[PDB]
Amino acid sequence: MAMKRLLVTGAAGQLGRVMRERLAPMAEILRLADLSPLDPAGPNEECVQCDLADANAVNAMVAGCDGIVHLGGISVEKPFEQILQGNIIGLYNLYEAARAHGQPRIVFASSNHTIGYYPQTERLGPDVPARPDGLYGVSKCFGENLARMYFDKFGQETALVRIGSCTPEPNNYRMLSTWFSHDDFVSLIEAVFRAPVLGCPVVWGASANDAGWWDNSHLGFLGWKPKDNAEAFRRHITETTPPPDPNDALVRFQGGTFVDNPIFKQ
């Protein structure tokens, strides 16, 4: 096994539930954490329910962990205060906790929404300027900037994974480009943790899709090559869903419908 104990935050969410199962082989003990109720710990599991904005709780959550896959916090556009707590204060707390406990390597769930306002016709490398499509996107930029600072100042290593659409299967036109299969995310995580040297790289979270918009070539040193391809689903999507309207944000902006979100108020 890769390590003694691996922490997975956001473990009660759909993706966290997948990781709770798929990542078990990577560690002797998997510690699952979330604010929302977790299914009780089974064999080789520990479960912690805590508020990322509670610094003391996050310290205890991280203590004893050799790596972290951080999926926790707010995962969609919400009012500012929710995002502030889960994704901004929460991120500061996470990095301070790691700094106090041996700087376990972090896989950070960033998001395509950091660059949501780019047109879908534009191919992006990892250094493109952020164009976040809402407060959620801005908060993920915050996590990226904070992680980079901790890397430069303390040596803390983080993979900044800008997740596209990590779902079981592509099911709309945009997902033909953004789909990130479970298998490919799992292999990415394995490659991140196995690397002797990681740094603080931006990683585009997508499978090897023919219609992909993003260039991961500079990540070559990691030896991670995604194997799934959303294009296999194009025919299926055409046969089972209505054609998109060319005016829909779904087929105009990389962030899809998030660009149409207002600023939500509580």
Write out the residues near its own copies by the rule CB under 8 A. Answer: 80, 84, 88-89, 92, 96, 99, 117, 120-123, 127-135, 137-138, 141-142, 145-146, 148-149, 152-153, 173, 176-177, 194, 196-197, 199, 201, 209-213, 215, 217-218, 220-225, 231, 234, 238, 243-246, 248, 251-252, 259, 263
Q: Are 86 and 53 in contact (CB under 8 A)?
A: yes
Shortest gap between Cβ of 19 and its own copies (angstroms)? 23
E strand segments, the chain: 3-9, 27-34, 45-49, 67-70, 105-111, 158-163, 202-205
199 is in an annotated binding site: no
Closest contact distance (angstroms) between CB of 34 and its own copies is 23
Consult the annotation and say whether 182 binds a ligand. Answer: no
Quote the tokens at residue 154: 């303390």
Distance (Å, rounded) from C-alpha 235 to C-alpha 110? 30
**Shortest distance (Å) from residue 107 CB to its own copies:** 17
The amino acid occupying position 212 is G
60 vs 251, which CB is nearer to its own copies? 251
Q: Of residues 95, 136, 150, 173, which has the active-site annotation?
A: 136
| Distances in whole angstroms, Cα of residue 202 to Cα of each of 61, 82, 112, 120, 235 | 25, 25, 11, 19, 32
Annotate 47-64 with DSSP letters as a single string: EEE--TT-HHHHHHHHTT
The yes-or-no answer on residue 136 being catalytic is: yes
Q: Is 140 labelled as part of a ligand binding site?
A: yes
Q: 21 vs 152, which CB is nearer to its own copies? A: 152
Within 13 Å of residue 13, how many CA atoms lie on the same side as its CB?
18
Instruction: Confirm whether residue 174 is marked as ligand binding.
Output: yes
Annotated binding site for substrate, which residues?
75, 111-113, 165, 174
Annotated binding site for NAD(+), which residues?
14-15, 34-36, 51-52, 71-75, 140, 166
- Residues tagged active-site: 136
